[PDB]
Design an enzyme around this catalytic site. Structure first.
Site, PDB file in Angstrom:
ATOM      1  N   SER A 102       0.746  -1.208   0.000  1.00  0.00           N
ATOM      2  CA  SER A 102       0.000   0.000   0.000  1.00  0.00           C
ATOM      3  C   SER A 102       0.779   1.262   0.000  1.00  0.00           C
ATOM      4  O   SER A 102       0.327   2.269  -0.507  1.00  0.00           O
ATOM      5  CB  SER A 102      -0.802   0.082   1.284  1.00  0.00           C
ATOM      6  N   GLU A 322     -10.493   7.502   0.377  1.00  0.00           N
ATOM      7  CA  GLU A 322     -10.147   6.063   0.280  1.00  0.00           C
ATOM      8  C   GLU A 322     -11.204   5.134   0.949  1.00  0.00           C
ATOM      9  O   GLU A 322     -11.526   5.402   2.090  1.00  0.00           O
ATOM     10  CB  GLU A 322      -8.825   5.809   0.922  1.00  0.00           C
ATOM     11  N   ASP A 327      -9.603  -3.669   1.014  1.00  0.00           N
ATOM     12  CA  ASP A 327      -8.316  -4.397   1.124  1.00  0.00           C
ATOM     13  C   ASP A 327      -8.295  -5.261   2.371  1.00  0.00           C
ATOM     14  O   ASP A 327      -7.863  -6.436   2.384  1.00  0.00           O
ATOM     15  CB  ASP A 327      -7.159  -3.368   1.183  1.00  0.00           C
ATOM     16  N   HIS A 331      -8.089  -9.245   2.507  1.00  0.00           N
ATOM     17  CA  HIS A 331      -7.017  -9.901   3.279  1.00  0.00           C
ATOM     18  C   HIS A 331      -7.612 -10.966   4.235  1.00  0.00           C
ATOM     19  O   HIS A 331      -7.049 -12.021   4.422  1.00  0.00           O
ATOM     20  CB  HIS A 331      -6.255  -8.863   4.152  1.00  0.00           C
ATOM     21  N   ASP A 369      -5.069   0.943  -5.424  1.00  0.00           N
ATOM     22  CA  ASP A 369      -3.594   1.009  -5.286  1.00  0.00           C
ATOM     23  C   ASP A 369      -2.872  -0.236  -5.845  1.00  0.00           C
ATOM     24  O   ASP A 369      -1.732  -0.165  -6.335  1.00  0.00           O
ATOM     25  CB  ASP A 369      -3.223   1.214  -3.821  1.00  0.00           C
ATOM     26  N   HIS A 370      -3.502  -1.405  -5.724  1.00  0.00           N
ATOM     27  CA  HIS A 370      -2.933  -2.656  -6.270  1.00  0.00           C
ATOM     28  C   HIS A 370      -4.073  -3.719  -6.350  1.00  0.00           C
ATOM     29  O   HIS A 370      -5.194  -3.445  -5.887  1.00  0.00           O
ATOM     30  CB  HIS A 370      -1.815  -3.172  -5.404  1.00  0.00           C
ATOM     31  N   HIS A 412      -1.847  -9.447  -1.713  1.00  0.00           N
ATOM     32  CA  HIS A 412      -2.032  -8.518  -2.841  1.00  0.00           C
ATOM     33  C   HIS A 412      -1.523  -9.298  -4.048  1.00  0.00           C
ATOM     34  O   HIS A 412      -0.770 -10.272  -3.892  1.00  0.00           O
ATOM     35  CB  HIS A 412      -1.076  -7.298  -2.714  1.00  0.00           C
TER      36      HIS A 412
HETATM   37 CO   LIG Z   1      -3.414  -1.317  -0.599  1.00  0.00          CO
HETATM   38 CO   LIG Z   2      -5.365   1.735   2.038  1.00  0.00          CO
HETATM   39 CO   LIG Z   3      -3.335  -4.706   1.815  1.00  0.00          CO
END
Ligand SMILES: [Co+2]
Ligand SMILES: [Co+2]
Ligand SMILES: [Co+2]
Ligand SMILES: [Co+2]
Ligand SMILES: [Co+2]
Ligand SMILES: [Co+2]
Lengths: 449, 449
Positions: A102, A322, A327, A331, A369-370, A412
């Site tokens: 991140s 955000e 995320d 996870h 972001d990813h 990720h």
């Molecule tokens: Co991230």
């Molecule tokens: Co974040």
């Molecule tokens: Co993450």
């Protein structure tokens, strides 16, 4: 009649079992796309990041909440789209590290320089680089940093802190893990100390826990970081009521909304995926988190309020919003949590597009972001990782799989992913681009000299 | 200079460890995109499908073969891009089936109707629908169908055969699995028999095996399908030199190239990924497959030859090209085979773009039928499925994970994925669209009514 159109309806047009019934297009798009292109200046920019929101996360959330032929009125409504790369760098060799965290990714779009995983606002040589928010303020624009995560979290922290490790939330962690950043050692301090120094106009999110820390040195040595915040003129809110009764936010009274001790509440709850969960356990219907509250502003509410307070600046504003726990939930291999947070982000995206379409000089960008772990797989799948069956809006089952970690957290992934935009200079996200191109795109669209 | 530009370079421009060095853009793209928009007629269409080639597959291949900051001169060079959905339908309920196979997705862009997994050229009621290739031919356009897979495989077969199950390759399997389509029972026949009737001007790929079967009825009862093609006026070729000697292809002398018994040879060899393969083994470097050959035409060569033969039609042509083994190798958890097939497709895309930019009235579209298993993960990942470390062009290790099946084959995934285009009517792939919109986009661009 906002010259630049926001897609109103790209849901399936009819009966999906009939010829043409699943079409999302009603006719040629050449003229509508010509209409979406302008190189006039962006007076304002709103960047929304769904943390870990790759195309798979977008698709799974749409399938569940809107149906496979449904349409996110925010996320799916940006007319100009492409795919960008977010690889990071190996700190020692400088070569690509194909799966970023991140911190490196957010350093990339906020500074325009690639960096190593865990770095915030510095390069592989630990040299600081100016962030788009620091630069926006320096140019006299109003600045907003909004997130459902704790504010020390990499995504909003990259806009105001330059540290060698994202773990440096406060004096304590800093003195320990970022010795040269630690205040008492001459550095600029922990993430929260630099956030207080950065002084954006509007900073809303969670993470109040670190503010209970006390500075080891400096002008406010011995005083708690919240004490330090009160002492430097900040206007601190803690719930929806106190946030909504805020009428202004500027340098004299910059706003610091700390709505939770750590991350803000997730919208939806569900069982975590499990080994063979789609085979051995019942299909799941997500449920609203009873502890989420009308006393806690939603992302969409924090977005709207930041927009109201920042748009009073006639020079303009830069705002980053955000949807952070997409995320977090990916996870935790928790489809419901994950999807609900995408749904949450979509509501914030709709507020942004509704503001931009009327304002006319606002570039809005939605991306992630990813990429992440979750995959949509066949209902009968026997996978080695964690799976779960969900009952979707279509009245059919969708199965999600998390299969890239035997550890506690799923990981990720490095796939390039969607970036979409609307408004001035939105052509710059079409085709293949890099995450660092987004820094340059925002800097130039605002005309920051 | 043909007003519509092909992207010349979207690689990182400089030193990726430096500010701006990872940028893929060198300035504003508004003018470039305006110049990429035209709604004039498409005289020709070239549709290139990488089977299973989702964004993750494109990224992994680019990272390995071109470096993280590299650029696929074919695949990454289409200027207009979007993301499309490819869900199929449950045959019984008509509701979405979130993860399609190759047959239902190829049926969707080739006919404009969603269908059930395994169907080819028919909807959920098993009703036949004309395909874009049959419509092109009916309007006087030349037609080509090229694949590195056996020609009976779903992707090329969907353009010329209408059967209730993609397994109906020849007389024997059709009798067993598609009794309603079996020639001896009054049906239109097997996939290979229907392909012979469709009579595209150019058909090139593998799959000679089924042509050894003999027809159970009809004018060519008792003769092999290969004898049938010969008696029906086809020019049969089986290697690179015989293909090269071909000077014309049309309805009087249609071209049928059968270059392998089953699928054509993969470009690169490498070991299969294994449990903890990135922890327990050294990194793999891919290597050229000796079984390739100057005697076996490459996909780029078959694409060029087809373009040359089809362009002799002044009205125009429709050409589909499939890089097929990306899917086979992703199912086989074989990074090297998978990446080499994406490199292979990139060369065919370059040939198509080169022709299109010069010709000026050719719409080129590049996408995949559905997404797949492979994921790019951190080097130290400890995953439950199959993984492999690879030595990339950058001199760094990339790790790929196949984590969605304990069963022998890794499986397809439901994520929306990239579709990109160049030329007249390319705006129609931008933003969110459905795979069935591609059929309508192609029909309208060629002005088929
Ligand atoms: Co991230
Ligand atoms: Co974040
Ligand atoms: Co993450
Ligand atoms: Co396929
Ligand atoms: Co195929
Ligand atoms: Co497949």
């Amino acid at each position: 009649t906002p010259e630049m159109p926001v897609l109103e309806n790209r849901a399936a047009q009819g009966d999906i079992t009939a010829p043409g019934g699943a079409r999302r297009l009603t006719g040629d798009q050449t003229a509508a796309l010509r209409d979406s292109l302008s190189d006039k200046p962006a007076k304002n920019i709103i960047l929304l990041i769904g943390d870990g929101m790759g195309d798979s996360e977008i698709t799974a959330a749409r399938n569940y909440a809107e149906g496979a032929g449904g349409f996110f009125k925010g996320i799916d409504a940006l007319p100009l789209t492409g795919q960008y790369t977010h690889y990071a760098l190996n700190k020692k060799t400088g070569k690509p590290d194909y799966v970023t965290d991140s911190a490196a990714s957010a350093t990339a779009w906020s500074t325009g320089v690639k960096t190593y995983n865990g770095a915030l606002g510095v390069d592989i040589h630990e040299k600081d680089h100016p962030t788009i928010l620091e630069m926006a303020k320096a140019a006299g624009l109003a600045t907003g940093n909004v997130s459902t995560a704790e504010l020390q979290h990499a995504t909003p922290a990259a806009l105001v802190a330059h540290v060698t490790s994202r773990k440096c939330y406060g004096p304590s962690a800093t003195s320990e893990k970022c010795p040269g950043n630690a205040l008492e050692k001459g550095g600029k301090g922990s993430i929260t100390e630099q956030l207080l120094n950065a002084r954006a106009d509007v900073t809303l999110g969670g993470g109040a826990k670190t503010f209970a820390e006390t500075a080891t040195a400096g002008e406010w040595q011995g005083k708690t970081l919240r004490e330090q915040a009160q002492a430097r003129g900040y206007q601190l809110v803690s719930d929806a009521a106190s946030l909504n009764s805020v009428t202004e936010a500027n340098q004299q009274k910059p706003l610091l909304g700390l709505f939770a001790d750590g991350n803000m509440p997730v919208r939806w709850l569900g069982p975590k995926a499990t080994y063979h969960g789609n085979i051995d356990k019942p299909a799941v219907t997500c449920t609203p988190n009873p502890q989420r509250n009308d006393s806690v502003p939603t992302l969409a509410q924090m977005t709207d309020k930041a927009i109201e307070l920042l748009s009073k600046n006639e020079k303009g504003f830069f705002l980053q919003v955000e949807g952070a726990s997409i995320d977090w939930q990916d996870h935790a291999a928790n489809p419901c949590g994950q999807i609900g947070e995408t749904v949450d982000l979509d509501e914030a995206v709709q507020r942004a597009l509704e503001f931009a379409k009327k304002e006319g000089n606002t570039l809005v960008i939605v991306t992630a972001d990813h990429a992440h772990a979750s995959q949509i797989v066949a209902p009968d799948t026997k996978a080695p990782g964690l799976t779960q069956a969900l009952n979707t809006k279509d009245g059919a089952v969708m199965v999600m799989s998390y299969g890239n970690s035997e550890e506690d957290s799923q990981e990720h992934t490095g796939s390039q992913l969607r970036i979409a935009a609307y408004g001035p200079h939105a052509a710059n996200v079409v085709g293949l681009t890099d995450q660092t191109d987004l820094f340059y795109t925002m800097k130039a669209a605002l005309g920051l000299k």
